Write a protein that binds this ligand. Structure first.
Ligand SMILES: CCCCCCCCCCCCCCCCCC(=O)OC[C@H](COP(=O)(O)OCCN)OC(=O)CCCCCCCCCCCCCCCCC
Ligand SMILES: CCCCCCCCCCCCCCCCCC(=O)OC[C@H](COP(=O)(O)OCCN)OC(=O)CCCCCCCCCCCCCCCCC
Ligand SMILES: CCCCCCCCCCCCCCCCCC(=O)OC[C@H](COP(=O)(O)OCCN)OC(=O)CCCCCCCCCCCCCCCCC
Ligand SMILES: CCCCCCCCCCCCCCCCCC(=O)OC[C@H](COP(=O)(O)OCCN)OC(=O)CCCCCCCCCCCCCCCCC
Ligand SMILES: CCCCCCCCCCCCCCCCCC(=O)OC[C@H](COP(=O)(O)OCCN)OC(=O)CCCCCCCCCCCCCCCCC
Ligand SMILES: CCCCCCCCCCCCCCCCCC(=O)OC[C@H](COP(=O)(O)OCCN)OC(=O)CCCCCCCCCCCCCCCCC
Ligand SMILES: CCCCCCCCCCC[C@H](O)CC(=O)SCCNC(=O)CCNC(=O)[C@H](O)C(C)(C)COP(=O)(O)O
Lengths: 158, 127, 60, 120, 170, 65, 178, 84, 276, 458
């Protein structure tokens, strides 16, 4: 651990207000922006609860020290930066509201699926009777048993 | 007149964010300050990476505080509550018990059928 | 021309392989039949396939 | 996509025949005598011409001809044209054969309905 | 290759009956292949086989003769049973390449008879069940620790059935 | 090699125009040639029968009763 | 990308940066040109009026209702240029922008050819080490007298001194490596 | 062809000479759009946008709130596409 | 598969109508044509499905390299919005593009026509979902529409490309292959259809509306699209948003199913399966 | 088999007696040839397995491994010449000897007729491994990792000791040959239901099962590269080899006493595969990849169908070679980067063109690309698992999709993307690094040509 004191590494949930302001230094944040992850004992500890926004909408023009993570050097990394990376989940505002999206998409899906059902109920079939194959519907050639002759299926003219 | 409606995804854009438009003097003071923390950190990366005569690895300790927080500062901050042990048993034994009654029932259906003589097992000369 | 180089040299080899390994080994190059039609002769046996009947439908 | 669908789905029913079971009345519902269809090709001729089972129709015989003139006349793929018309025609003449059978079954079922009201 | 273990049907080919003035683009090419691809190769190959026939050598088959099986074998006598689990593990393979041949002989009979496979190729599929119903009846339930003692039991569990069912029919 | 042009219609080489008109004209020669020799795009060449003109004798429609 | 981000945004830069997104999102709707150039000088009108509102409150109430009018009247697929974010050719030729500190591990054979190239390269590396001291000192002697620090860095202010923290704005991998 | 500065220089000059508000016989590099050519800030948004469409790339917002000399535009464009 | 092939045909085609990226429109057309290919396999007509695969390869390959020519000749502009009047500036690719476009729209006596209308009338004659039959035909009109969208925006319009013009397609390596495939696109359907073995026993007997349906729907598809493109040139109704979006941002399957699944599948590993 | 072993022992005298400067080449060159003598065992022209002598035997299952165990010693000694080149000339000769003893012991364990010979040699391999991990381990936590590696194996080991002494009294000899040709059929009592667990549990522990696999992620993290190669390639497979030879007895119980493990493994396969999806330490991700691809194996050595066992033998040899390759290249990044973090070091192909080709082939071996023994293996275990219950494809079907995702993510965020701005400049690749890789993959290409050799006993 080259140059890392325990107090320069994370610690326990900041209980007293002086500890919440000490941690905010460790993490190079503003003391009024350090909002520890809720204390429900799932391990987060003192790690800052940074806004859940993906690196996708981090200004795409600024010279980010780490270009591809669109993260500067020192800025507190997000807990789930392994998911909000540009190559994965996005949380980038969308011109259409999310609900509107979910409803519309699935509506389409449902209407389609349904209409397809209306279809199977009412199919489209030309005015043509059934096709007629010779012999006994090709009983033997459809691989039928040579020994056992089939009930003759005959087809008459017109 | 549809109003954009940020969801945990598809969040509220910068514009259309009421907070941003109106802000108290204190707020500006914050922002004017947060830049300072960043500018400070920026001028602590930019004259150590642009330093001639350097071979050592710029460390990015903000990433080292992240990994330690995520794989070596977890169990020292574990307190067994409810919503954690109920949810810590449904996850380990829940499906593990689900599939057992999925595989037992199938394996038992199969065995019965084989025993009674129905399963065809045709052209199956391998297993 | 060099064209022949990597079209002819590879070919001889392949042929060497296909006519003296594959061909030789059993069921390595199998075909279908030759689609004989009524009235066409079978070279190997000498038989002449019997012709069809004289359907006179016409009316095209 | 004809009007047959309209007649069955929309509006009336029990008149337009069911696509399945088209041949549903006795082969002679008043048909005095009807010679069964005739198959020109021998079950073997087909098996030797390797005609796909589906293509073994009552036109299998004009097909074999086409295929003959397509193997022969090989370098020329544009010259077995009369043979294709023939096959196709044979295929139409049975396409209409099927059309006629369907219409006959339609009308016959109507007969039933007409006869039905004679009843009471 | 034995024409009888890997059979192969006689060939029937329609004779050439051209009905077009145009010249077949295949016949010309072959006439070349036969000269610029076959002759050159043909020459080399022969020269191979004469190099072989000078110091012609031979290799035999290693006939394994029979030996007491399990049912003849004492219980606990690891010597006899060892010699007899091998005699079976050996026939577990000889009885497996046989099934490899029926897997193969068939495959060919459905490439050689397309569009007729439904019918012409039923000499073998009748055999692929006459051989599969047997392989299923001596070697299938067994674990990966297949041993002659277990085939002896897989059988003998069922020899009851061909004796309980039979007696049952009474 | 050609020369960059600013706010002007790029000069065109003889070949660019001729090859372009060549490919298009052959497309039209082929469409016209086949249409004349084989006009079965419309009607195929087999006419649909009017299913509603089949004398009741034709279909086996017994005389009602 | 070059200049540093201001801390907070003014009223103006927010208005004047809508005039860009707006007009540029009006040229996706107006695919043609005469229609566009028309429908756009009509846009300026909208911004042209309500230019002299002195009532800030009002101004920030026209802006807040402009950017919602816009969000709901934007094009899903606008015209974003290539080499700009999101659109193509953005990071295309970055696979070929190697970072230039890699020519330092080249085998003496490789660097044997390309001879004058490394003769000028060694000059520039002498420039870089010859000023790090005067630079960092400058960066510091001119340090802020307050915690208010912006990422803006100072110019040279003396002859011979190289405008500071410059080794990576100059010596940047070329854009199109090709 | 690659963009030589003395060309890019003329190209940016040219387009402005086609903007009606900016006199065609005075626009002179080093003639600040706003304090010399006397153009509205609202205009400068457009003047830049024209350039972004003459040279086919986007001058980022923060770097373009300052393209006011009619020359800054000529070195910034050139510095962007690496024209020495 | 008849059902899902049918849904993809229209779903992809409708998305293609509003896409403004030239390569994207062609790609959606790749999916829509394969949707038709899926439909024929679903109607158990395997041989003709294979016939479309071969004919599909010639023309789609042409259109994409045609746009390759336009994109490379222009300063890497991949958007129909800034590309215009390629017909006069670059007749060689424009000629190749329209040859390909008409083949895509099943112009009579071109490679698409020999295989595509066989598939269309197959549908019109088989017993099938009514919803599938209707969508496949309007999908065919949509193929004409987006085909119309490409040539109107890319070729027949006043130029909107960046002002300096440097276009060269003279390089043999551009023309030759484009020229060679163009010959294939013009003659391949003729050659492949006659040569292949008789198969499928098609039904050439149809009421004339169904026999000519593919031809007419393709014709009015362009007709209606040409009408809509004209409406654009006028000075009016800058913005038009009639569900245009659902069409323009891929039916919203990308916006929603790509942000939820990768988010709920990774959150569960880190937060629940790994750490808990 | 004392040429694969005695000449090996003599390596120890050579590492010690040889010159400090020439110690490395004498040892690596000689064990390459030691591997060549190992290849002679592959000459089996008959089914009768090869019983070299009373205590030493080699059957199809052991032979494919003995050769791998002999093969990696050369490679291990080539991958640790860098780190361990900063030592005092007597710390090296200890590390080299430690590596030498591992394959001496492992060669014998894989080539042992008496099951308790397996146990004594089986549990001895921990001594050399714990020293390699604890003494040379870089991180502060290796003392902890060593404890985890010793206790999980040891607590499992003493039950097996009691069980094997137990069967010796019940049957009268622990000789694998006889035990096979003798009637040992457990009687489904409650006690036997315990015997079975006693014998399998020790093997199931070092073959990380979902329940007890925490030892392997911790151990490989701080272990030096040579220790991580040994643990993944040969050490974990010791557990599989044991399960194949021990379930010859306990024949009836595993029919119904396996369900617990089978379900533990298949669900485990999914969760272990998934957490690979977001793990920041590359060595961490390869280790969980190793747990999941080994969870498939315990689910084939328990279904017990000929193909399973054959799939298992294929996958174990194949995954062994692939994992090392991944652990070896992970180390090359670690030594120049100086950090295990996956997020740093992005874009390497831009600066290390070939290592990236090795990275790509290693990942394609990691996921199941088809002309690879890795796929043949999974395809077979998949088939049998399907036979056990058609539903198994769902769980063995979520693993395939996840396995593709993490394997490519290792390539996408380590060997592609924009280059890291200026980490300590990354010196070019040594020829040793590249060969150490080539030596791993060239055998993977050659074995895939003729899969029959690693096909198992079934
Ligand atoms: C991604 C795959 C999507 C498609 C999956 C389903 C494909 C078709 C197969 C399912 C339907 C088969 C119907 C024919 C009978 C098959 C044999 C059979 O009898 O199945 C029995 C099985 C028993 O399961 P169970 O619900 O426990 O019933 C206990 C009854 N005393 O009852 C079942 O059939 C179970 C059906 C499968 C359920 C598991 C696979 C889908 C769900 C995955 C969940 C993963 C997480 C597991 C749970 C986590 C939370 C606890
Ligand atoms: C896929 C990877 C490449 C596959 C190569 C397949 C051929 C491999 C082979 O075994 O060729 C040599 C072969 C050896 O002899 P053997 O197999 O024992 O046959 C004896 C027949 N009585 O036969 C010989 O040694 C005779 C000499 C042969 C020399 C020329 C061989 C050229 C073979 C070209 C086959 C190409 C197959 C298609 C490759 C597709 C690759 C994707
Ligand atoms: C009533 C009917 C009367 C008779 C009408 C007959 C018309 C039949 C059609 C004639 C024209 C056919 C044709 O020109 O084909 C164009 C060819 C692609 O045709 P296609 O059959 O699709 O081949 C590709 C793979 N199938 O595309 C080409 O071949 C383009 C030219 C290729 C040149 C190749 C040069 C080879 C040598 C290279 C080194 C110099
Ligand atoms: C037909 C009628 C019914 C219609 C609906 C039926 C359901 C259809 C969809 C079923 C599930 C399909 C797969 C879901 C994931 C799709 C792939 C994906 O989302 O990756 C895209 C993601 C972001 O990329 P994108 O949004 O395209 O933007 C790129 C340009 N900005 O790029 C990423 O890298 C995201 C992260 C990828 C790595 C982790 C992904 C999760 C891996 C394990 C779960 C895999 C998915 C779930 C299991 C399989 C389900 C089928
Ligand atoms: C704690 C870890 C150990 C937990 C239990 C492990 C499994 C049981 C002990 C080890 C395995 C074993 O050999 O147990 C079987 C033994 C009875 O042996 P068995 O062969 O069934 O003899 C029956 C004679 N009629 O039955 C037993 O040995 C029962 C042993 C009970 C105590 C287990 C160890 C407790 C350690 C504290
Ligand atoms: C042994 C147990 C495990 C030990 C692991 C470590 C061992 C290291 C030290 C020993 C290394 C050498 C010994 C192992 C390799 C053995 C190679 C071999 O056995 O080749 C056999 C092959 C003859 O083929 P054969 O299978 O006899 O014929 C089949 C007839 N039905 O003869 C040949 O054809 C040789 C051909 C050489 C070049 C072949 C290249 C072919 C590549 C094909 C796949 C390409 C794509 C692979 C994708 C992989 C993706 C990861
Ligand atoms: C295509 C998408 C259509 C979207 C169009 C959009 O929704 C409609 C629209 O923009 S509605 C414009 C009204 N927007 C204002 O009215 C702001 C006025 N802001 C001020 O007046 C300032 O206070 C100041 C005095 C500094 C101006 O000075 P300056 O010259 O801009 O620097």
């Amino acid at each position: 651990a080259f140059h890392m004191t325990k107090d320069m590494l994370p610690g326990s949930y900041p209980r007293t207000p002086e500890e919440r302001a000490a941690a905010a230094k460790k993490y190079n944040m503003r003391v009024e922006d350090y909002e520890p992850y809720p204390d429900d004992g799932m391990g987060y500890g003192d790690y800052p609860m940074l806004p859940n926004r993906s690196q996708h909408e981090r200004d795409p023009w600024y010279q980010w020290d780490h270009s591809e993570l669109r993260m500067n050097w020192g800025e507190p990394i997000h807990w789930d930066l392994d998911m909000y990376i540009r190559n994965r989940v996005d949380t980038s505002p969308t011109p259409v509201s999310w609900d509107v999206m979910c409803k519309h998409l699935f509506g389409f899906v449902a209407f389609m699926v349904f209409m397809f059902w209306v279809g199977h109920v009412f199919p489209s079939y030309q005015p043509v009777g059934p096709k007629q194959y010779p012999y006994n519907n090709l009983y033997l050639e459809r691989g039928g048993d040579p020994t056992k002759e089939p009930e003759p299926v005959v087809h008459y003219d017109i | 007149g549809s109003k954009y409606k940020p969801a945990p995804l598809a969040t509220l854009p910068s514009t259309l964010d009421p907070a941003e438009y109106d802000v108290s003097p204190e707020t500006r003071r914050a922002q004017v300050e947060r830049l300072s923390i960043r500018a400070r950190l920026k001028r602590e990366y930019l004259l150590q990476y642009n330093d001639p005569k350097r071979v050592s690895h710029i460390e990015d300790p903000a990433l080292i505080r992240w990994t330690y927080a995520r794989s070596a500062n977890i169990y020292p901050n574990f307190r067994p509550t409810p919503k954690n042990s109920l949810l810590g048993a449904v996850a380990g034994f829940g499906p593990l018990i689900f599939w057992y009654y999925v595989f037992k029932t199938d394996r038992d259906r199969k065995e019965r059928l084989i025993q009674e003589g129905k399963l065809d097992r045709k052209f199956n000369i391998s297993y | 021309l060099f064209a022949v180089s990597h079209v002819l040299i590879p070919m001889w080899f392949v042929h060497y392989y296909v006519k003296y390994h594959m061909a030789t080994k059993p069921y390595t190059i199998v075909s279908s039949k030759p689609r004989i039609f009524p009235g066409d002769t079978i070279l190997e046996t000498g038989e002449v396939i019997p012709p069809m009947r004289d359907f006179p439908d016409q009316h095209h | 996509m004809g009007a047959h669908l309209t007649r069955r789905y929309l509006w009336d029913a029990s008149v337009e025949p069911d696509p399945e079971k088209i041949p549903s009345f006795p082969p002679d519902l008043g048909f005095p005598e009807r010679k069964e269809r005739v198959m020109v090709a021998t079950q073997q001729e087909m098996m030797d011409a390797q005609l796909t089972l589906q293509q073994r129709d009552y036109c299998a015989h004009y097909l074999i001809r086409l295929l003959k003139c397509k193997r022969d006349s090989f370098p020329n793929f544009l010259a077995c044209k009369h043979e294709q018309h023939d096959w196709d025609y044979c295929e139409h003449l049975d396409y209409v054969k099927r059309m006629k059978e369907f219409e006959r079954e339609r009308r016959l079922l109507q007969r039933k309905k007409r006869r039905a009201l004679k009843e009471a | 290759w034995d024409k009888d273990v890997y059979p192969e049907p006689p060939s029937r080919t329609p004779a050439p009956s051209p009905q077009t003035s145009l010249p077949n683009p295949i016949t010309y090419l072959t006439k070349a292949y036969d000269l610029v691809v076959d002759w050159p190769v043909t020459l080399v190959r022969e020269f191979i086989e004469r190099q072989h026939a000078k110091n012609r050598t031979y290799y035999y088959h290693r006939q394994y003769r029979r030996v007491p099986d399990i049912t003849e074998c004492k219980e606990g006598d690891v010597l006899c049973i060892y010699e007899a689990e091998m005699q079976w593990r050996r026939d577990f393979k000889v009885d497996q390449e046989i099934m490899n041949i029926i897997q193969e002989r068939l495959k060919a009979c459905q490439q050689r008879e397309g569009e007729n496979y439904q019918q012409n190729c039923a000499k073998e599929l009748e055999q692929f069940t006459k051989v599969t119903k047997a392989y299923q009846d001596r070697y299938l339930d067994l674990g990966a620790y297949y041993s002659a003692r277990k085939c002896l039991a897989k059988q003998k569990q069922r020899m009851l059935e061909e004796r309980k069912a039979a007696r049952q029919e009474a | 090699h050609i020369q960059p042009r600013y706010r002007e219609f790029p000069q065109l080489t003889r070949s660019q125009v001729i090859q372009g008109e060549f490919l298009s004209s052959l497309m039209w020669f082929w469409i016209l040639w086949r249409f004349w020799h084989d006009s079965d795009a419309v009607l195929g060449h087999f006419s649909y029968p009017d299913p509603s003109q089949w004398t009741d004798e034709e279909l086996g429609i017994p005389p009602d009763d | 990308a070059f200049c540093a981000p201001p801390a907070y945004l003014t009223h103006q830069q927010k208005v004047l940066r809508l005039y860009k997104r707006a007009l540029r999102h009006l040229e996706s709707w107006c695919i043609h040109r005469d229609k566009y150039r028309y429908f756009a000088c009509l846009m300026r009108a909208r911004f042209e009026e309500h230019k002299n509102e002195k009532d800030m409150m009002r101004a920030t109430q026209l802006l807040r209702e402009a950017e919602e009018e816009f969000w709901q009247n934007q094009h899903p697929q606008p015209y974003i240029f290539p080499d700009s974010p999101g659109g193509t050719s953005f990071e295309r030729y970055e696979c070929y922008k190697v970072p230039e500190w890699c020519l330092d591990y080249w085998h003496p054979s490789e660097k044997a050819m390309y001879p004058d190239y490394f003769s000028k390269r060694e000059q520039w590396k002498k420039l870089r080490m010859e000023s790090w001291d005067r630079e960092v000192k400058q960066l510091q002697e001119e340090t802020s007298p307050d915690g208010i620090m912006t990422e803006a860095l100072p110019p040279a202010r003396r002859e011979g001194d190289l405008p500071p923290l410059w080794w990576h704005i100059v010596t940047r991998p070329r854009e199109r490596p090709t | 062809p690659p963009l030589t500065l003395d060309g890019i220089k003329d190209r940016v000059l040219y387009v402005l000479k086609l903007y009606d508000k900016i006199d065609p016989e005075k626009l002179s590099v080093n003639s600040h759009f706003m304090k010399d050519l006397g153009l509205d800030s609202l205009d400068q948004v457009e003047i830049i946008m024209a350039m972004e469409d003459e040279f086919g790339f986007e001058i980022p917002d923060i770097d373009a709130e300052k393209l006011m000399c009619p020359q800054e535009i000529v070195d910034y464009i050139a510095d962007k596409k690496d024209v020495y | 598969m008849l059902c899902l092939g049918a849904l993809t045909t229209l779903f992809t085609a409708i998305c293609a109508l509003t896409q403004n990226d030239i390569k994207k429109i062609i790609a959606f057309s790749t999916s829509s044509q394969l949707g038709l290919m899926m439909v024929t396999l679903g109607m158990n007509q395997p041989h003709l499905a294979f016939l479309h695969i071969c004919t599909h390869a010639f023309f789609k390959a042409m259109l994409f390299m045609c746009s390759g020519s336009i994109i490379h000749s222009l300063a890497d502009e991949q958007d129909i919005r800034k590309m215009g009047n390629i017909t006069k500036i670059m007749p060689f690719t424009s000629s190749c593009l329209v040859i390909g476009s008409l083949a895509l729209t099943g112009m009579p006596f071109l490679t698409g026509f020999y295989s595509k209308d066989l598939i269309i009338e197959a549908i019109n004659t088989c017993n099938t979902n009514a919803w599938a039959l209707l969508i496949t035909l309007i999908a065919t009109s949509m193929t004409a529409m987006y085909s119309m969208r490409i040539i109107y925006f890319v070729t027949m319009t006043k130029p909107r490309f960046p002002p300096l013009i440097s276009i060269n397609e003279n390089d043999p390596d551009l023309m030759n292959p484009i020229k060679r495939l163009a010959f294939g696109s013009i003659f391949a359907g003729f050659v492949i259809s006659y040569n292949i073995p008789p198969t499928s026993i098609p039904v050439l007997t149809m009421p004339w509306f169904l026999k000519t349906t593919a031809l007419i729907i393709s014709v009015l598809g362009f007709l209606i699209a040409l009408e809509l493109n004209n409406l654009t040139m006028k000075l009016s109704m800058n913005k038009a948003n009639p569900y245009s979006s659902f069409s323009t941002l891929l039916g919203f399957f990308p916006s929603i199913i790509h942000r939820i699944t990768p988010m709920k599948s990774l959150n569960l590993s880190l937060k629940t399966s790994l750490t808990l | 088999m004392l040429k694969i072993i005695l000449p090996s022992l003599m390596l120890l005298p050579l590492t010690w007696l040889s010159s400090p400067k020439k110690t490395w080449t004498n040892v690596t060159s000689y064990s390459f040839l030691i591997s060549l003598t190992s290849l002679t065992l592959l000459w089996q022209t008959d089914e009768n397995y090869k019983n070299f002598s009373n205590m030493f035997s080699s059957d199809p299952l052991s032979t494919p491994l003995i050769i791998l165990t002999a093969w990696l010693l050369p490679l291990m000694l080539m991958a640790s010449q860098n780190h361990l080149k900063k030592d005092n000339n007597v710390l090296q000769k200890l590390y080299i000897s430690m590596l030498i003893s591992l394959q001496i012991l492992l060669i014998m364990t894989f080539s042992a007729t008496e099951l308790i010979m397996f146990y004594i040699l089986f549990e001895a391999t921990l001594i050399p491994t714990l020293i390699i991990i604890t003494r040379w381990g870089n991180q502060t936590e290796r003392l902890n990792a060593g404890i985890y590696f010793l206790f999980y194996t040891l607590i499992g080991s003493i039950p097996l000791l009691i069980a094997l002494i137990l069967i010796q009294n019940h049957v009268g000899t622990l000789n694998l040959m006889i035990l096979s040709f003798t009637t040992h059929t457990l009687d489904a009592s409650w006690s036997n239901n315990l015997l079975w667990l006693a014998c399998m549990m020790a093997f199931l522990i070092k073959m990380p099962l979902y329940g007890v696999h925490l030892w392997l992620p911790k151990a490989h993290v701080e272990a030096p590269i040579a220790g991580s190669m040994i643990l993944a390639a040969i050490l974990l497979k010791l557990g599989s080899y044991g399960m194949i030879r021990i379930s010859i007895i306990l024949d009836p119980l595993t029919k119904y006493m396996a369900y617990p493990f089978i379900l533990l493994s298949l669900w485990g396969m999914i969760m272990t595969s998934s957490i690979c999806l977001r793990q920041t330490d590359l060595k961490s991700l390869i280790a969980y990849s190793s747990v999941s691809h080994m969870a498939l194996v315990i689910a084939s050595i328990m279904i017990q169908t000929p193909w399973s066992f054959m799939g298992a033998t294929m996958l174990m040899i194949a995954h062994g070679l692939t994992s090392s390759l991944l652990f070896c290249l992970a180390n090359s990044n670690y030594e120049r980067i100086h950090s295990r973090t996956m997020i740093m070091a992005r874009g390497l192909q831009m600066v290390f063109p070939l290592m990236a080709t090795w990275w790509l082939m290693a990942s394609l071996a990691n996921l199941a690309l088809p002309p690879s023994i890795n796929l043949m293996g999974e395809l077979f275990i998949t088939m049998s698992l399907f036979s056990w219950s058609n539903f198994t494809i769902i769980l063995m079907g979520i693993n395939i999709i996840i396995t593709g995702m993490y394997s490519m993510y290792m390539i996408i965020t380590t060997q592609r993307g924009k280059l890291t701005n200026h980490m300590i400049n990354l010196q070019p690749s040594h020829t040793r690094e590249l060969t150490l890789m080539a030596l791993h993959m060239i055998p993977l290409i050659l074995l895939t040509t003729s899969p029959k050799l690693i096909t198992g006993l079934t």
